[PDB]
Structures are given as structure tokens and as C-alpha cells.
Amino acid sequence: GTILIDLSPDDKEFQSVEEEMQSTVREHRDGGHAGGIFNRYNILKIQKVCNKKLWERYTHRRKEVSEENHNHANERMLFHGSPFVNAIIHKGFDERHAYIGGMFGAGIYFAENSSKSNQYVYGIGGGTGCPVHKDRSCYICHRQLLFCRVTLGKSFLQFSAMMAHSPPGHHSVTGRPSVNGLALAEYVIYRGEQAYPEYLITYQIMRPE
């Protein structure tokens, strides 16, 4: 039931989405090992993901979290990178998109830094890089990220020195780097229904000059 609508680069929605991409790149402590070396992206396409069934699944859960949290969904827009992006846009987030060995427990991870999500585009740790060149820093091959609507409800705050249940009380976990003062948060949900993949972003990382 999914349809994809191209946003025009002249459209203001294309532009605020690109801005959130570009403005949340940071340097990474792995020197670019997982996601490659770059400061900015070349944005190639931005599509809006439309699936009535997945949307209702999301808003139905959103209402429930909302009611449990002093009428507050605590709804964010957050990046998600994964080899399973084409499956997510068609069938939604589920247990199979969960990071079993994740630091904040076994759920689905999202990132405020788009460059954090880019590290996972070719799998945990960048896997072996693009399918074509086996290059985690490939500047040629087209990559895809999702920019997603995520319901956090009451988030459990977990300071970090950088499918399970949420801790009782909580609808999600915030993993908040405490050492790297420029690293933004990651969040973990334990139910697929708590994220909708609104935008599919197709891009290349750009070689620095």
C-alpha cells in the first residue's frame, strides 16, 4: 500500500528536510571508518512515503502513548539508516529492525545526527560498505536514509560514556552521549508502531576538498 511522491528541490519541504540532513553532520570518533569521510551530502532525491495503513498504525499508537504521558507524545523527527530501508517503507518498522546488541537494549535506534544514521546504511559498523566497491567511504554509490516521525512518550534518560521492553514507566530510551560534547542523542523504541518513515532520502556523501 505504499506510494512515494518526489519532492521538488524548489519545494520548502524538500529544503527543510535537506537542511536537517546537512546541518546535523558531525565528525565521528572512528575517523570515518563505518560511514566514510565527509562534511556534507549531495542530496539526490527526497521522497515522501505514503501508506494509509502504516500511518494509522502509527497514530493509533501515538494516541495511546500520549494518554499515558500527561497528554504528551513527545514526537520527534529523527534519522534512521539501515540496509532494510526498502522493506521498512513497505511493511513498517518491526522486531527485525531492532539492534540486538545495542547499548540501550534491544530496540529500534534512531539518531539526531544524520551522520550517525549514515554509519549504519551498509549494516552494523558500516558492514562491508557499498555492494559495488566494498568501500565504506564510497563517494559514487547512491545511499538511502529515512527521516522518521518517532513517538518517544516518557523517555528514560540513559547517559552514555560516548526486542526488549522499555524500562517500567517509559515508552523509549534516550541514549545521550556524555563525553563527546558535540554528539547528539540516539533514541530507542521497543514497538515498531512508534515510528513512521515519512521521508526517504537518496544521497551521496561528498569527498572533502
Ligand SMILES: COCCNC(=O)c1ccc(-c2ccc3c(C)cc(=O)[nH]c3c2)c(Cl)c1
Ligand atoms: C543480529 O542481527 C540481525 C539483523 N539485523 C541487522 O543486521 C541490523 C540491526 C540494527 C541496525 C541498526 C543499528 C543501530 C542504528 C543506529 C544507532 C542509528 C541508525 O540510524 N540505524 C541503526 C541501524 C542495522 Cl544497520 C542492522
Ligand SMILES: [Zn+2]
Ligand atoms: Zn560503491
